[PDB]
């Protein structure tokens, strides 16, 4: 309750002559991970679907295929072009889930306001053997 | 005469192998003049073969029905030249290799970056050690008694 | 030169020197003492 | 809006966004003659229950296969003609 | 305590941690985090790297034992 | 004219001359695979007839008994068998892909953006009608190819 | 008939039992409850 | 437009870098913590695009490497022509080449 | 899908998450180390299993740890 989602509007998309690494039927029945970024100038970048695109001066919008595509793109953006980015997840029903910072801050700065999960308060050798959790849903690492 | 094997000094098929190889090398000898380099080399190989067969005869090797020397490893005193004396001759050299290598690795172990001495072999150090493996059967025995051969876990 | 000898002491150069010397040794032994299957001295 | 200048994320029209398009699926009416269409309808409505179609297909096809292979003679397949040749005696007598 | 809690800086130490690369191997303590809330303060520096080309790792006080030398 | 599909560059396809052209798109749009408006039974009839002839082709002349007098008859019989199997696999496809009564999974949109009606072929009863048409048309095309090989053997090649 | 039983059972087994089995198993694969 | 742009004494002829293996790379010019290092010493040996970033040094390296390759091929042809000269039957093969 | 777990040996160097290409991880505050931060794995549904996180964990064996488990369309990394 400190950072609200951004709710990407109908922004323009980058100039691109079209490729074959784009959105297949996965988008037509599942999510397709829109990404939004804001360019200082009309520059040219490698698309994660192969090929070169020309980002527009101002906000852009790309609906590529999946999470790793937009996050690889955004990492290349932030490192090479020094640009803030945020990407989403667009289910076919209509909902738009905000995902990349989920706090307004990238997931490297340990900013308070995030609860620690996937957290085993022990060294990695002190997990029990499988026989101790035989015939139980907990495999080895959830106690 | 053990293991059903006749000696090669009194074997028929062994002499037959000899005659067959000699006729094979002589068939390749009637194509050159008897004084040129090929014929001289063929005659040298012929004498090499004949002395080879006669030496395998005179050492008491055992030639089976196929007519080839079958080495005896069991430990028969007559056949220690087959395995046991060259086996000791091997193990002496092999332990030389191992012992000079081990004493070298222990020598460089007290270095700042020892791995560079395994790449860039310290030839003075090894050469001072290279003859220290001459006495490996006694130095290693003492290092085993003193406890310096095998390392301790800590 | 110190560095030339440092390179001659490197593992491949010293390995090929050592194995060329060794190979010449075994070669000349198998020419002077060819065709050897049994150790006949004190046999 | 999907028709704006380089806008392809109409969040309302998710079909145009995700690529849901009948790329060649013409909605043009039946170009066939009505009478032959009714003929085929009445003569292929038996093959309307996919389960009954499958049972009929499997059972009748297996029956026809067994019938063909059982009534066919050796003239159409040599395996049923038989040897029509004396048998060769194998190695070492016959063993 | 404000005085040191763990081994001395430079004390060659053994690792009792069964999952580490240097298990039953000696080390060289380069630092000990004197904060009395961290779980693995003992920063050791070994001589030979692990499979990840790393020669240093944090260890606990009970997962470490100094040698008689 | 290789601009992307519907001018959408992030969809994995392009409107090249082969896909989206006045001739080839028209041809792919006026044949029984893409007649989304007409019922699937006539579509399947057309499809089965065409593939029955196409299968009787390489069974009479190419086969185990092509040189015999049983070439045409037994080849057409094998073609009818392959047709029965194709209707079989089509049937399990219609059973496995969509169950009984769901709406059509086909796109309800076109290139021009019209919210067209969904293709009822992709439904259960629709695909079943298509399979029935395919079986009927295929057996009929097999026997008609046999008839044409019987009564009109001379214009066609024997070799 | 005993010489004609392989001619009934081999085309039965090696073609229909694959039809029945592979079809029913593809249906068992593509199922939902 | 075109010219003979060429700079003198850029690199020193010295065995100092022979003594330090893996000098060409940063991670390799610090020592063999592992054995993989030696495999990386040969793997990256001629990966001049990874040693430097400027194309000038890479071009010089590959130019002189081509010269080494041509030296090797001239030495190889030396061997072939020599072995033909001394250890061959070419002087006899000309007489009856269809049977010798 | 996959079960990513972060153990208490973490030094909080932020390499696990700066290497992770699918936003699975995130650093949170903690009191067990000098850096006062530890990695967490909320978005394990987005975990493909590439183990770039644990190819960048500089500890005795590991602190982050990926367990291969029920593979879905997004853990299998499918654009279709
Ligand atoms: C591991 C399996 C194996 C074994 C056991 C052998 C064994 C042998 N091979 Mg075969 N061979 C092998 C693999 C093997 N070979 C392979 C893989 C190949 C293909 C590369 C060959 C190809 C091959 C050929 C082509 C020939 C042999 C020959 C020989 C014989 C060598 C005798 C000789 O000259 O040594 C004599 C001893 C030495 C060379 C070592 C001398 C060591 C020095 C002097 C140090 C010792 C002295 C030291 C100071 C200590 C003294 C005591 C005191 C000071 C303490 C021997 C029977 C030759 C032969 O005669 O066949 C019968 C032969 O012509 N081999
Ligand atoms: C032996 C292979 C074979 C053959 C000869 C045919 C032949 C035919 N099919 Mg069938 N079909 C086949 C396999 C085959 N099909 C398979 C495996 C499927 C399942 C996907 C279908 C599904 C299908 C449908 C749904 C329809 C047809 C239709 C047709 C007819 C015209 C359209 C056409 O094929 O061109 C179109 C060709 C293509 C789209 C392929 C383009 C790829 C490249 C560019 C061509 C390369 C060819 C080159 C020589 C190599 C024609 C009689 C139509 C029909 O029956 O109308 C009466 C129709 O509606 N086919
Ligand atoms: C192995 C390939 C092959 C073979 C041997 C045949 C063989 C035959 N075809 Mg088929 N045919 C084939 C492939 C083949 N076809 C393909 C790929 C097509 C296009 C889809 C056709 C389309 C076709 C038509 C349209 C017709 C034939 C017909 C025929 C027959 C006479 C042709 C004169 C002959 C049995 C003719 C016929 O009536 O068969 C009896 C006929 O009308 N064929
Ligand atoms: C293991 C069991 C098995 C059996 C019993 C058969 C039986 C047969 N195969 Mg073989 N086949 C098999 C497995 C089998 N196949 C497999 C695994 C493969 C892939 C490697 C093939 C590939 C193969 C080829 C490529 C060909 C055959 C052919 C044939 C036929 C013999 C040719 C002949 O001289 O008669 C001549 C007989 C005829 C021309 C009449 C055919 C009878 C039809 C098919 C019966 C129709 C019944 C029904 C409607 C459809 C089947 C129902 C389904 C439930 C099984 C015969 C029907 C040849 C053939 O004729 O096929 C066209 C041929 O060309 N087979
Ligand atoms: C696991 C044991 C076993 C195996 C591997 C075989 C293997 C075979 N049998 Mg035999 N068979 C068996 C048990 C077995 N049989 C038993 C127990 C019976 C009595 C019910 C038969 C009765 C039988 C007949 C009547 C025929 C075969 C035939 C065959 C052949 C083709 C497959 C077929 O259609 O079988 C069908 C078998 C069954 C449905 C019985 C399954 C139980 C094949 C060599 C055929 C043949 O002779 O081809 C050369 C054939 O016509 N089998
Ligand atoms: C002999 C005199 C000599 C000396 C002392 C040097 C000294 C130096 N050179 Mg120069 N160089 C020379 C001759 C010489 N070079 C020649 C003749 C050529 C032309 C080929 C070059 C081309 C050259 C280039 C292109 C580069 C150097 C570089 C270097 C430096 C590092 C070289 C090193 O450590 O690798 C030592 C490597 C070796 C000892 C072996 C190299 C392989 C040789 C050339 C051929 C192998 C033939 C062999 C038979 C083939 C293998 C088959 C076998 C299995 C049978 C060092 C300052 C490098 C440098 O300064 O960059 C920072 C660099 O990039 N040199
Ligand atoms: C004009 C020819 C030419 C040139 C100039 C190059 C140059 C280069 N190649 Mg390319 N390459 C070539 C031909 C060529 N290659 C061919 C013909 C192939 C097909 C196999 C390749 C496949 C290839 C791959 C797949 C890779 C390169 C790489 C490289 C670079 C570094 C190679 C290196 O450092 O290894 C130095 C030399 C060695 C490590 C020795 C190789 C040992 C060989 C395999 C020994 C066995 C072969 C021998 C004939 C058999 C006798 C055995 C006997 C000794 C017992 C360098 C830029 C690499 C690169 O750029 O990495 C980023 C890389 O990954 N090349
Ligand atoms: C007529 C002029 C001429 C000639 C004959 C050559 C010939 C050659 N060049 Mg090229 N080159 C030239 C002009 C010329 N070049 C110019 C103007 C430039 C600058 C743009 C280059 C830039 C260039 C590069 C960058 C490379 C070459 C390479 C090569 C060799 C390719 C391998 C081959 O086929 O070997 C066949 C072998 C022979 C024909 C043996 C010829 C031996 C003579 C003495 C050397 C060639 C004459 C030379 C240019 C004269 C320079 C003066 C010198 C005597 C002081 C080959 C020797 C490549 C190579 O192998 O690198 C070594 C290479 O990497 N050259
Ligand atoms: C590709 C190059 C090449 C290759 C593969 C060979 C290969 C060979 N040469 Mg040749 N040679 C070459 C170039 C080459 N030579 C050149 C350039 C010269 C001129 C100097 C010679 C001059 C030469 C002579 C004079 C002799 C050989 C001999 C030999 C053989 C044994 C050499 C040996 O073990 O030396 C010993 C190993 C080291 C020094 C290491 C071998 C078949 C010998 C031969 O054939 O014996 C009958 C021999 O007597 N070579
Ligand atoms: C007589 C004989 C025989 C037999 C024999 C036997 C049976 C033996 C056994 C033996 C044994 C049973 C042994 C054991 C051993 C053990 C151990 C445990 C050891 C150890 C050792 C060590 C540890 C060493 C080391 C080293 C060296 C010294 C060398 C080099 C270096 C090194 C360091 C490596 C026969 C008849 C066949 C033939 C003839 C001869
Ligand atoms: S890489 Fe490992 S040690 Fe570094 S922050 Fe992530 S979990 Fe902690």
DSSP D42-94: HHHGGGG-HHHHHHHHHHHHHHHHHHHHHH--TTT-HHHH---SPPPP-SSTT
The DSSP H or E segment spanning B103 is helix B84-109
Residue I73 CA to residue A68 CA, distance in Å, equals 13
**Inter-CA distances, A71 with A22, A36, A91, A111, Å:** 15, 11, 18, 20
**Which residue is closest in CA terms to ligand 7's atom 2?**
H66
Nearest ligand (C-alpha, residue F56): 3
Beta strand pairing call for I26-29 and I37-40: antiparallel
Size of interface A-E (CB pairs under 8 A): 8
Q: Which two tokens stand for residue F138?
A: 């295929």
- CA G7 – ligand 5 centroid, Å: 12
Distance CA C35, CA B45 (A): 11
Q: What token pair was written down for D9?
A: 């994320």
Residue in the structure block whose two tokens are 């057996």? F139
Q: Which of G28, F121, A107, I16 is nearest to D27 (CA)?
A: F121
CB within 8 Å: G16 and D54: no
Q: How far apart are CA F107 and CA F116, in angstroms?
A: 8
Residue B48 to residue B54: CA distance in whole angstroms = 10
CA distance readout (Å), D58 to D61, E29, F86, G22: 5, 77, 11, 12
Q: B123 in contact with H at a CB cutoff of 8 Å?
A: no
H helix or E strand, kind and range, residue C6: helix C2-8
3 state SS of B124: helix
Report the distance separating Cα E68 and Cα E12, nearest Å: 9
Nearest residue to H21 via CA among H2, H40, H7? H40
Q: Is the CB of F27 under 6 A from ligand 3?
A: no
d(Cα F85, Cα F142) in Å, to the nearest integer?
Answer: 14
Of C10, C34, C42, the CB nearest to B48: C34
**Which residues pair with residue I38 across a beta bridge?**
I28
**DSSP H/E element including F145:** helix F124-151
Q: Whose CA is nearest to atom 19 of ligand 3?
A: F54
Contacts 24+ apart (CB under 8 A), B36-41: none
Q: Are D19 and A90 spatial neighbours (Cβ–Cβ below 8 Å)?
A: no
What are the chain E neighbours of A125 within 8 Å (beta carbons)?
17-19
Q: What's the rounded Cα separation, in Å, for the pair F45 and F49?
A: 6
d(CA H57, CA G21): 68
Say whether I33 counts as a known binding-site residue: no
* Euclidean distance between CA atoms I56 and E53, whole angstroms: 11
Phi, psi at E57, each rounded to 5°: -160, 150
Identify which ligand lies nearest to the alpha carbon of B71.
1
Output phi, psi for D22, to 5 deg: -70, 95
For residue F92, the distance in angstroms to the closest alpha carbon of chain G comes to 7
Residue A19 in contact with residue A50, Cβ under 8 Å? Answer: yes
Measured at the alpha carbon of residue I28, what is the angle toward residues I24 and I30, in degrees to the nearest 5? 140
Residue G17, H or E segment: helix G17-29
Chain E nearest-CA distance from H34, in A, is: 8
* Number of CB pairs, chain D paired with chain F, less than 8 A apart: 146
The phi, psi pair for B47, rounded to 5°, reads: -65, -35
User: Closest Cα to atom 46, ligand 5: which residue?
Assistant: G6
Query: What gap in Å lies between CA I9 and CA I65, rounded to an integer?
Result: 11
Element (H, E) at I3: strand I3-7
Contacts of B116 in chain H (CB under 8 A): 31-32
Contact between A34 and D9 using a beta-carbon 8 Å cutoff: yes
Please give the method by which this entry was determined. cryo-EM
Beta carbons within 8 Å of F127's beta carbon, 6+ residues apart = D50, F40, F90, F93, F94, F97, F98, F121
Contact A113, E7 (CB under 8 A): no
The residues pairing with B120 across neighbouring beta strands, listed in sequence order, are C10
Is I50 annotated as ligand-binding?
A: yes
Residues 61-90, chain H: which have Cβ within 8 Å of B?
A: none
SS3 call for G3 = coil
**Residue B141 CB coordination number (10 Å):** 11
Mutational pocket test of ligand 1: of C21, C31, C36, C41, the residue with most ligand atoms within 8 Å of the beta carbon: C36
Residues 6+ apart with CB under 8 A from F10: A13, A16, A18, A19, A22, A23, A49, A62, A63, A64, D8
Query: What CA–CA distance (Å, rounded) separates E53 from H26?
Result: 15
**Which of H12, H15, H20 should be substituted to probe chain C, the one whose Cβ sees the most C Cβ atoms within 10 Å?**
H15
* Integer-rounded Cα radius of gyration of chain C: 17
CA H82–ligand 6 middle distance (angstroms): 26
Q: Does I16 show up as a binding residue in the annotation?
A: yes
Residue of the CA atom closest to atom 31 of ligand 6: H17
DSSP string, C13-42: HHHHHHHHHHHHHHHHHHHHS-S--S--TT
Spatial CB neighbours of A12, under 8 Å, sequence gap ≥ 6: A56, A58, A59, A60, A61, D4, D5, D6, D7
Distance CA A28, CA A22 (A): 12
Residues in chain E with CB shorter than 8 Å from the CB of I6 are none
What is the three-class DSSP state of I66?
strand
Q: Which of B69, B86, B123 sits opposite C9 (nearest CB)?
A: B123
Question: Which positions ≥6 away from F117 have C-beta within 8 Å?
Answer: D27, F36, F37, F108
Pick from B29, B81, B88: which is nearest to B56 by CA? B81
Task: Answer for the pair F98, F122: CB distance below 8 angstroms, yes or no.
Answer: yes
Q: DSSP letters along H37-86, please?
A: HHHHHHHTTT-HHHH-SSHHHHHHHHHHHHHHHHHHHHHHHHHHHHHHHS
| Calculated CA dihedral for residues F69, F72, F73, F78, nearest 10 degrees | 120
Rounded to whole angstroms, the Cα distance separating F75 from F82 reads 11
> Of A69, A131, A133, whose CA–CA distance to A100 is shortest?
A69
Q: Is B151 on the interface with E (CB under 8 A)?
A: no
Pocket test for ligand 11, best of I19, I64, I65, I66 (most atoms within 8 A of CB): I64
Cβ contact F59:F145 at 8 Å: no
Is the CB of residue H42 below 6 angstroms from any atom belonging to ligand 7?
Answer: yes
- Sheet architecture: strand order including B69-70: B6-7, B62-63, B69-70
Alpha-carbon span A86 to A93, nearest angstrom: 21
Look at the alpha carbons of A75, A77, A83, A89 in this order and tell me if their dihedral is positive or negative.
negative
Is-contact G8 D70, C-beta < 8 A? Answer: yes
Among all bound ligands, the one having the nearest atom to the CA of F27 is: 2
* Numbered residues of chain E with Cβ closer than 8 Å to any chain A Cβ: 17-19, 60, 63
Element (H, E) at A68: helix A67-76
Contacts of G10 in chain D (CB under 8 A): 69
Q: CB–CB of D62 and G7 under 8 A?
A: no
How many CA within 13 A on the CB side of residue H81? 6
Phi, psi for residue A53 in degrees, rounded to 5? -120, 155
Please report the atom of ligand 8 found closest to the CA of residue H64. 62
Q: Say which ligand is closest to the CA of H70.
A: 8
Can you say whether the dihedral through the CA atoms of B56, B58, B59, B62 is positive or negative? Answer: positive
Name the phi and psi angles at E32, rounded to 5. -140, 115
Q: Do I60 and E59 touch (CB under 8 A)?
A: yes
* Interior/surface letters B44-55, b for 16+ CB within 10 angstroms, e for the rest: eebeebeebbeb
- Nearest-Cα distance to chain A for D54, in Å, is 30
Query: HSE-up of I13 (CA within 13 Å, CB side)?
Result: 17
Question: C11, B123: Cβ pair inside 8 Å?
Answer: no
- Whole-number Å distance between alpha carbons of I3 and I70: 9
User: From the CA of H42, how far away is ligand 8's center (Å)?
Assistant: 28
> What contacts E19, CB < 8 A, 6 or more positions away?
A123, A124, A125, I60, I61
Q: Nearest CA to B28 among B9, B41, B17, B13?
A: B41
Neighbours of F78 (CB within 10 A): 20
Pairing of strands A119-120, I3-7: parallel
I13 is in an annotated binding site: yes
Q: I57, I8 in Cβ contact below 8 A? A: no
Regarding the beta carbon of H76 and ligand 9, being less than 6 Å apart is answered yes
Residues 6+ apart with CB under 8 A from I60: E17, E19, E20, E21, E22, E50, E57, E58, E59, I9
Query: Closest Cα to atom 51, ligand 1: which residue?
Result: B89
In F1-123, which residue ranges form alpha helices assigned H by DSSP? Answer: 24-29, 40-60, 71-97
Nearest to I36 by CA among E19, E59, E33: E33
Counting one residue from A and one from D, how many pairs have CB atoms under 8 Å apart? 50
8 A C-beta contact, residue I44 and residue I80: no
The CA distance from B118 to F54, in Å, is: 74
C-alpha distances out from residue B121 to A6, A65, B107, Å: 65, 56, 12
d(C-alpha H24, C-alpha E69), whole Å: 41
Kindly give, in sequence order, each residue whose CB lies less than 8 Å from that of residue G21, ignoring residues fewer than 6 positions away. none
Please give the Cα distance from I49 to I38 (Å, whole number).
Answer: 20
Going by C-alpha positions, the residue among C38, D30, F64, E28 that lies closest to residue B80 is: C38
| Those residues with Cβ within 8 angstroms of residue A43's Cβ, 6 or more apart along the chain or in another chain | A54, A55, A81
Q: Which of F141, F88, G10, F71 is nearest to D60 (CA)?
A: F88
Query: Does F97 reach chain D within 8 Å, measured CB to CB?
Result: no
DSSP SS3 for A99: coil
Query: Which 52-71 residues of chain B touch chain C by CB within 8 A?
Result: 52, 55-56, 58-61, 69, 71
Kindly identify the ligand whose nearest atom is closest to the C-alpha of H49.
7
Instruction: In whole angstroms, give the CA distance from residue I59 to residue E52.
Output: 9
The span from the CA of H97 to the CA of H82, in Å, is 20
Cβ atoms of G27 and F95 closer than 8 Å: yes
Element (H, E) at F150: helix F124-151
Separation of alpha carbons B89 and I57, rounded Å: 52
Q: Residue I69 in contact with residue I41, Cβ under 8 Å?
A: no
Question: How many angstroms away from the CA of A90 is the closest CA of chain F?
Answer: 15
Q: Phi and psi for A103 in degrees, rounded to 5?
A: 175, 5
Among I37, I41, I74, the residue with its CB nearest the CB of A110 is I37
Cβ–Cβ < 8 Å for F76, G7:
no
Phi and psi at F73, nearest 5°, equal -65, -55
Residues of chain F contacting D22 with CB distance shorter than 8 Å? 34, 36, 106-107, 109-111, 116, 119
Question: Cα separation of A3 and A12, whole Å?
Answer: 25
Domains of chain E: 5-69 (2.30.30.50)
Q: Which of residues 47-76 of I touch E (CB under 8 A)?
A: 55, 58-61
Through-space distance between the first and last CA atoms of chain I, rounded to whole angstroms: 18
CA distance E62 to E17: 9
Q: Which of I41, F151, E49, F27 is nearest to A119 (CA)?
A: I41
Secondary-structure percent of chain A, ordered helix, strand, coil, rounded to 5: 15, 20, 60
Backbone φ/ψ region at H32: left (φ over 0), alpha (ψ -120 to 50), beta: beta
Measured in angstroms, the resolution is: 3.2
């Amino acid at each position: 309750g400190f950072t609200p989602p951004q709710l990407d509007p109908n922004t323009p998309s980058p100039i691109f002559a079209g490729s074959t690494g784009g959105l297949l039927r996965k988008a037509q029945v599942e999510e397709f991970y829109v990404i939004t970024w804001n360019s200082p100038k009309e520059q040219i970048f490698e698309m994660p679907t192969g090929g070169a695109a020309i980002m527009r001066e101002g906000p852009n919008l790309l609906k590529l295929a999946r999470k790793e595509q937009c996050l690889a793109l955004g990492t290349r953006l932030r490192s090479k072009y020094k640009i803030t980015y945020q990407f989403y997840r667009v289910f076919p029903n209509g909902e738009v889930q905000y995902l990349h910072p989920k706090d307004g801050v990238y997931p490297e700065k340990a900013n308070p306001g995030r609860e620690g999960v996937g957290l085993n308060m022990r060294s990695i050798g002190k997990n029990v053997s499988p026989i101790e959790v035989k015939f139980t849903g907990k495999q080895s690492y959830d106690l | 005469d053990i293991s059903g094997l006749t000696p090669c000094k009194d074997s028929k098929q062994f002499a037959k192998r000899e005659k067959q190889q000699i006729k094979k090398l002589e068939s390749s000898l009637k194509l050159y003049a008897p004084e040129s380099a090929p014929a001289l080399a063929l005659n040298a190989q012929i004498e090499k073969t004949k002395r080879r067969f006669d030496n395998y005869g005179k050492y008491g090797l055992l030639c089976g029905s196929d007519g080839l020397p079958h080495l005896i490893v069991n430990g028969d005193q007559r056949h220690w030249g087959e395995f046991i004396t060259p086996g000791i001759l091997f193990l002496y050299i092999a332990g030389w290799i191992g012992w000079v290598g081990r004493s070298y690795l222990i020598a460089i172990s007290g270095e700042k970056k020892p791995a560079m001495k395994e790449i860039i072999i310290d030839v003075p150090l090894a050469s001072r050690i290279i003859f220290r493996g001459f006495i490996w059967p006694v130095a290693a025995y003492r290092e085993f008694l003193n406890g310096d051969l095998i390392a301790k876990d800590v | 030169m110190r560095d030339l000898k440092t390179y001659l002491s490197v593992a491949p150069v010293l390995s090929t020197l050592w194995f060329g010397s060794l190979a010449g040794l075994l070669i000349e032994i198998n020419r002077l003492f060819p065709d050897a299957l049994t150790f006949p001295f004190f046999s | 809006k999907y028709g704006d200048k380089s806008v392809y994320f109409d969040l309302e029209d998710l079909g145009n966004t995700t690529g849901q398009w009948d790329v060649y699926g013409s909605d043009a009416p039946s170009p066939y003659n009505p009478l032959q269409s009714k003929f085929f309808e009445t003569f292929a409505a038996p093959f309307t229950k996919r389960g009954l179609l499958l049972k009929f297909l499997i059972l009748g096809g297996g029956s026809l296969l067994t019938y063909v292979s059982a009534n066919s003679t050796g003239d159409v397949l040599p395996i049923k003609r038989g040897p029509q040749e004396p048998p060769k005696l194998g190695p070492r007598g016959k063993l | 305590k404000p005085p040191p809690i763990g081994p001395k800086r430079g004390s060659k130490v053994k690792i009792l941690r069964r999952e580490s690369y240097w298990f039953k191997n000696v080390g060289s303590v380069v630092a000990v985090d004197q904060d009395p809330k961290t779980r693995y303060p003992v920063v050791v520096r070994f001589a030979k790297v692990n499979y990840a080309n790393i020669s240093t790792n944090n260890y606990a006080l009970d997962e470490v034992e100094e040698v008689a030398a | 004219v290789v601009q992307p599909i519907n001018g959408d560059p992030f969809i994995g396809s392009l409107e090249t001359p082969v896909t989206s052209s006045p001739l080839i798109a028209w041809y792919l749009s006026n044949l029984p695979g893409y007649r989304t408006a007409v019922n699937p039974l006539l579509r399947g009839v057309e499809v089965g007839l065409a593939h029955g002839f196409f299968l009787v082709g390489p069974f009479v002349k190419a086969g185990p008994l092509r040189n015999t007098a049983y070439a045409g008859s037994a080849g057409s019989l094998a073609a009818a068998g392959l047709v029965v199997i194709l209707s079989m696999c089509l049937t399990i496809y219609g059973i496995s892909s969509f169950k009984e009564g769901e709406p059509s999974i086909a796109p309800s949109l076109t290139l021009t953006g019209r919210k067209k009606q969904p293709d009822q072929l992709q439904t259960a009863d629709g695909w079943a009608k298509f399979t029935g048409g395919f079986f009927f048309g295929g057996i009929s095309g097999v026997t008609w190819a046999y008839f044409l090989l019987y009564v009109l053997d001379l214009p066609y090649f024997v070799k | 008939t005993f010489n004609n039983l392989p001619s009934i059972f081999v085309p039965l087994v090696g073609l229909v039992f694959p039809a029945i089995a592979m079809a029913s198993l593809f249906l068992h694969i593509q199922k939902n409850k | 437009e075109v010219k003979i742009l060429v700079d003198r004494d850029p690199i020193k002829t010295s065995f100092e870098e022979w003594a330090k293996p893996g000098h060409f790379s940063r991670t390799i010019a610090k020592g063999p913590d592992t054995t993989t290092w030696i495999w990386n010493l040969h793997a990256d040996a001629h990966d001049f695009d990874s040693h430097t970033s400027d194309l000038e040094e890479i071009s010089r390296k590959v130019f002189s490497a081509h010269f080494g390759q041509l030296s090797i091929i001239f030495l190889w042809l030396s061997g072939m022509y020599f072995h033909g000269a001394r250890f061959s039957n070419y002087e006899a093969w000309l007489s009856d080449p269809t049977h010798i | 899908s996959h079960s990513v777990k972060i153990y208490d040996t973490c030094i909080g160097c932020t390499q696990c998450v700066r290497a992770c290409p699918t936003d699975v991880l995130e650093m949170i505050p903690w009191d067990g180390c000098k850096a006062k931060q530890i990695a967490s794995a909320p978005r394990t549904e987005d975990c493909v299993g590439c183990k770039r996180c644990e190819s960048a964990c500089p500890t005795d064996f590991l602190s982050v740890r990926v367990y291969l488990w029920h593979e879905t369309t997004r853990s299998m990394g499918l654009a279709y």
